[PDB]
Amino acid sequence: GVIESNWNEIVDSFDDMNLSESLLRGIYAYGFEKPSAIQQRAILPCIKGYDVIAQAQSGTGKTATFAISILQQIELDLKATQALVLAPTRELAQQIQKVVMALGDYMGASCHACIGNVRAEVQKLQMEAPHIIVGTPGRVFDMLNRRYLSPKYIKMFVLDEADEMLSRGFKDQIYDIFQKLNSNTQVVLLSATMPSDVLEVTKKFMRDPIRILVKK
């Protein structure tokens, strides 16, 4: 489905995004060069704290867009979970974790994956509360529900591939997680398609959002 863009800024260089020096070092050590259209448009309003709706296809640079925005906002000495990322699958959740960790490794920002027969992961969380959790909706709601994860400091909530998550039956978990977050929480939703039930999430959970369409 199709949204209309509404934001002004475009930034063609990661040098120009006001990133912390070691975040930038981390981005370049990883092998990113110049920002793609999504990164040029969306990184700055995400870091500014605005609700963002980004419609962009796969292969366009989304992961790095929110990985970078999230890492820039982290209060590094606040040993607490500060940002939550939802993905429709475990492999996509792990891939997101491996970008965030590889950039965060230059700043000392921690990131844990929260996925579905090993539940020793549900203990070990009791070294650090990680700064960033990435997970699938059932698993993340489980940890909120049973209080292994605290919503108290979560002040960034990212929904990657929102359409896929709805298609996979995750609307109750997502809404339940929404209800458990602080009313003040920044929401970033990314999706290739924007059908009405995706849009309804944006209507229930976002306020005066930034709208970015990257055309395929």
Numbering used by the authors: 21 to 136, 139 to 238
Task: Reproduce, without paraphrasing, sentences from the article in which this PDB structure was first reported.
DExD/H-box RNA helicases, from virus and bacteria to eukaryotes, play important roles in processes including ribosome biogenesis, RNA processing and folding, ribonucleoprotein (RNP) remodeling, RNA nuclear export, the regulation of RNA translation and transcription, and nonsense-mediated RNA decay. DExD/H-box proteins often contain accessory regulatory domains and localization modules, but their cores consist of two RecA-like domains joined by a short flexible linker. The N-terminal domain is commonly referred to as conserved domain-1, or DEAD-domain, and the C-terminal domain as conserved domain-2, or helicase domain. Both domains contribute to the binding site for RNA substrates and both contribute to ATP hydrolysis. We used X-ray crystallography to determine the structures of the DEAD-domains of DDX2A, DDX2B, DDX5, DDX10, DDX18, DDX20, DDX47, DDX52, and DDX53, as well as the helicase domains of DDX25 and DDX41.
DDX2A (eIF4A1) is essential for translation initiation. It is part of the eIF4F complex that consists of eIF4G, eIF4E and eIF4A. The eIF4F complex and eIF4A are potential targets for anti cancer drugs. Motifs Ia, Ib and II seem unaffected by the state of ATP hydrolysis, and their conformations remain unchanged even in the crystal structures in which the nucleotide binding site is not occupied. In all single DEAD-domain structures, α-helix 8 has adopted a position that would block the RNA binding site.
